[PDB]
Design a binder for this molecule. Structure first.
Ligand SMILES: COC(=O)[C@@H](C(=O)Nc1cnccc1C)c1cccc(Cl)c1
Ligand SMILES: COC(=O)[C@@H](C(=O)Nc1cnccc1C)c1cccc(Cl)c1
Lengths: 304, 304
């Protein structure tokens, strides 16, 4: 019992972190096999960041300008290429600590762990969600660029995020491991609209199931609703519309608890319309949306 | 910017986890140098747990009855001893992945990361506080016993907690790495009073400083208070009395923000007396007490 915002164990990712320096800029890189991946803005100076012509800036760099250090050992750079907003530095040595891995592009609403790093050194690990507006609400300071987000399935690490920047609003933006930004963002120091965010409805419902499983049940009521009625409420409260695909993903939790998905929707509708009346659910005084239905099943069943 | 409930990177601890089996019971062990540490209740059957005579139960066991497996490799047990509520199994091989480590007994109100494990395999990592009543509000299921809590300072892991049991109330109890329980708990399947818990005042104040640093400032007011006046409020709301030792520990945050500790106490007094009025601080609708002043400084400065 108990339910916590749990991150994946970070060991397999810690073994991949390196420091990349180009000129006077230092950030983190991810060393997998004989390639180091890092944000392409490592080649910029502060004056370049306002409107960088990355193609021109990269042309002024050679393999020997990219200093890559894995703890104490220096890596020899034998090639460099830019792919979208990431740089790929080919090195002469395969990382002996490379776990089994994949590069994935996650969907908005999905969750992942972030290993926050500075100067190639891990500082902490936390779990978060990719917001529906393709931002993440992380904890990142200057020097954290290149820190990565990932999920683990048994012995396979699926890397899904590389950190690039903080928007003027204090939220975070980054790319998949092919260097494609999540959302409309560009890697320039310009104010950029993130666009309307919404609460991840299917995740709130999964977390209400986790609450029932752990004994927080005060919010269960004698009501039911329909997908149509619930979605009118979701619209009013800036929640994502619930679909049959979301109801299907909640099947395991509905089966485990015996609470029909539309009955849990009626509990969520009442919580949206009335608030929590000074009460808490799983130690929270707000409706939590950073746990997917898969996260709830994994945590509630102790998957390793 | 951004502030998250961040755990230490778990890699150094992952390399120490093993599975320990004795008879039909399987739990986690911690392999450091040539010793494996685990909860002594690995020697119990279900019938023993109601009132175990651990001395008698252990006398029926020999070195070859303790099966210790580090992933795929089997460890050879050459000695066993019980120290308080932990068993120490001497093995013939030093763990090659033993980090620099210490065993520490943490104080109530201090925080640490937990690497939740099942069958010697890591499942997740989360940060928590040792409550003032010496319980922890973790996320643990059957088989998680032997999972450990720790802090990291550069390359040194200070182990402070080993998980033993879940109280009938769903909260958790465990020991230091010498097998001494935190709190009044005994390793028996009997209902046990945890005693009155309180909110960790110095941690709430540290988190309010973290909020100001990250731009959540709506709770700052034109008021001040004294330690005496604040402590009358703390008493009414079941908060730990604030001492000059706590004010001293908050010195760095007070210096960084220019907000005197007693002025932040007046903000906290107003939040206790009026609530949050439907607003949030650092994404929370309640006053958070799982960040120490050291945690806030570390996270806000990006220590690795
Ligand atoms: C001058 O460079 C910066 O401030 C970084 C950035 O956001 N770093 C940064 C990242 N995360 C947290 C805090 C900080 C500070 C920057 C800005 C704009 C565009 C890009 Cl691709 C990069
Ligand atoms: C029958 O044994 C148990 O249930 C364990 C225990 O709390 N495990 C356990 C631990 N954490 C979460 C869930 C579970 C289930 C037990 C009970 C009482 C005393 C001790 Cl020292 C151990």
């Amino acid at each position: 019992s108990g339910f916590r915002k749990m991150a994946f164990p970070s060991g397999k990712v810690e073994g991949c972190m390196v420091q990349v320096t180009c000129g006077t800029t230092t950030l983190n890189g991810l060393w997998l096999d004989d390639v180091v991946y890092c944000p392409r803005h490592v080649i910029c100076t502060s004056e370049d960041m306002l409107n960088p012509n990355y193609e021109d800036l990269l042309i002024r760099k050679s393999n020997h300008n990219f200093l890559v250090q894995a703890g104490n050992v220096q890596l020899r750079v034998i090639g460099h290429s830019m792919q979208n907003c990431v740089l790929k530095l080919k090195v002469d040595t395969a990382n002996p600590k490379t776990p089994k891995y994949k590069f994935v592009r996650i969907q908005p609403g999905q969750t992942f762990s972030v290993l926050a790093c500075y100067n190639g050194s891990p500082s902490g690990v936390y779990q978060c969600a990719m917001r529906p507006n393709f931002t993440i609400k992380g904890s990142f300071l200057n020097g954290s660029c290149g820190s990565v987000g990932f999920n683990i399935d048994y012995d396979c690490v699926s890397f899904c995020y590389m950190h690039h920047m903080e928007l003027p609003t204090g939220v975070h933006a980054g790319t998949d491991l092919e260097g494609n930004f999540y959302g409309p963002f560009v890697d320039r120091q310009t104010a950029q609209a993130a666009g309307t965010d919404t609460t991840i409805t299917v995740n709130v419902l999964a977390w209400l199931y986790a609450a029932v499983i752990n004994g927080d049940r005060w919010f269960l009521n004698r009501f039911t609703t329909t997908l149509n009625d619930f979605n009118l409420v979701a619209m009013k409260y800036n929640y994502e519309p619930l679909t049959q695909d979301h109801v299907d993903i909640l099947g395991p939790l509905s089966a485990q608890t015996g609470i029909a998905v539309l009955d849990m929707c009626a509990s969520l509708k009442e919580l949206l319309q009335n608030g929590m009346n000074g009460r808490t659910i799983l130690g929270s005084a707000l409706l939590e949306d950073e746990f997917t239905p898969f996260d709830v099943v994994r945590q509630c069943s102790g998957v390793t």
